[PDB]
Every structure is written in structure tokens, then in C-alpha cells.
Amino acid sequence: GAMGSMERASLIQKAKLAEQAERYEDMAAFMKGAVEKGEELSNEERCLLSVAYKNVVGGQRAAWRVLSSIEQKSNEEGSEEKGPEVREYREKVETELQGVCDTVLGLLDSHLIKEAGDAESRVFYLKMKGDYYRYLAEVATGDDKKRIIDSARSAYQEAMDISKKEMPPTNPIRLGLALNFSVFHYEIANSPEEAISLAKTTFDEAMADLHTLSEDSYKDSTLIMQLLRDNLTLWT
């Protein structure tokens, strides 16, 4: 581990600086180093880990989609053969993306999830596990595609089960989990009805719990509720 010689607190501090500088690859490397110290993460540190890798893999996904579109257009009838290069470069980006997903899943398995006992930590990490298997599923085509999809589903389902027992319906982690599992249903599992039902029920149950919240909690929860509504509008 190239961060092995850096203090945990210094890694966290530099992750925050890297975020301010929009240096998300550095931020992810610092947070990987922090996780590898072996101590549990705080709520804020979980956010730093998630933001870093979400931005890294999000950029990879966007690039993969551009390249995969070009590759598709080059395979249609009437397109001029341009050689192996588009496929090769799409594969290069894909392999890098898969490497990042493997890294995140590795941190979750060794050993974040097994030490996470509170709902706010355990649901967060299980949601992340679902997310990174979902990103692997977006690019998968081989013998293990169904197993990858099922690994995402299983992680999301365990997170959902805990969140419904242990968190109020407005908790932002519970809401974000439902948002993302709904997207999984729609985009990965070919289950648009489940996606829509989950988004609607999540939204409605959150609405009915807003009255219990402070102004600041209300702002946090309604922000994610609007994302649920946005997706419902896209899908209906």
C-alpha cells in the first residue's frame, strides 16, 4: 500500500483537500489508504470514500458509454471497417473501470462490512456493494453476468431489509439506497415495474414522515425525494 506510511488523519485531511481541488483519483487513493488502516470509518469518512469512488467510476462509465456507442455505430450495416481500435480502447476503459470496482468491493469485503454493526454504517456499505456490482453489471457480457447482477441484487436487498427495520423512511441513506435499487431494477434487471413501484412507495412513505423532521433534516430528505420524483417522471 503506497499510503501505508501516511498517518490516518493526514490521509483524511488530504482526501478533503483533494475533494476541494476536484482531484477525485487522489481523493480515492487517500481514502483507500485510510480504510486500509483497519479502523472503522465515521459517517463523514464514509461520505468521503463514497464521493471519491463515485466520481472516479462515474467518469469511467461516461467514457465507456461514449466508446460503446461509437463501437455500436461502427458495427451497423454500411459502416466502414476501421479495425480493432475502437473495441480495444473501449476494452481498455472497461478493464480500468472493472479494476476500480474490484478495489471498492475489496475494501467493503476486507473488512468494512463485517465490522459495520450500526444501520447507518452497514446499510451504507451494503448499498455501495450493490452499486459497484451494478457498475460491473453494466459492462458484463460473459458467463458470470447473471451472478454479477445477483450479487448486486443481494447486497441491495440486505441493505433494504435492514433500512426498513432500523431507519425512518426519511433517512437519506435509506432514501438513496431505494433510489439506486430502483435504478438497478429499471436498467439492470429489466424490471421497470419494480423500479417504479419502489420509487413511488419510497417517495410516499418519506412524504408522510417529513412532519417529524427539523428544517435541516427536511432539506436533506426532500433533496433525495426529488431525485425519486425525477426518475419517476423519466419513466412514466
Binding site: 452499486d131 438513496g176 439506486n180 435504478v183 436498467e187 433525495i224 431525485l227 425525477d230 426518475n231 419513466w235
Partner: peptide, 5 residues
Amino acid sequence: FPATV
């Protein structure tokens, strides 16, 4: 693409 967090 749909929203995720």
C-alpha cells in the same frame, strides 16, 4: 440517465 447517489 436516471439519478443515483
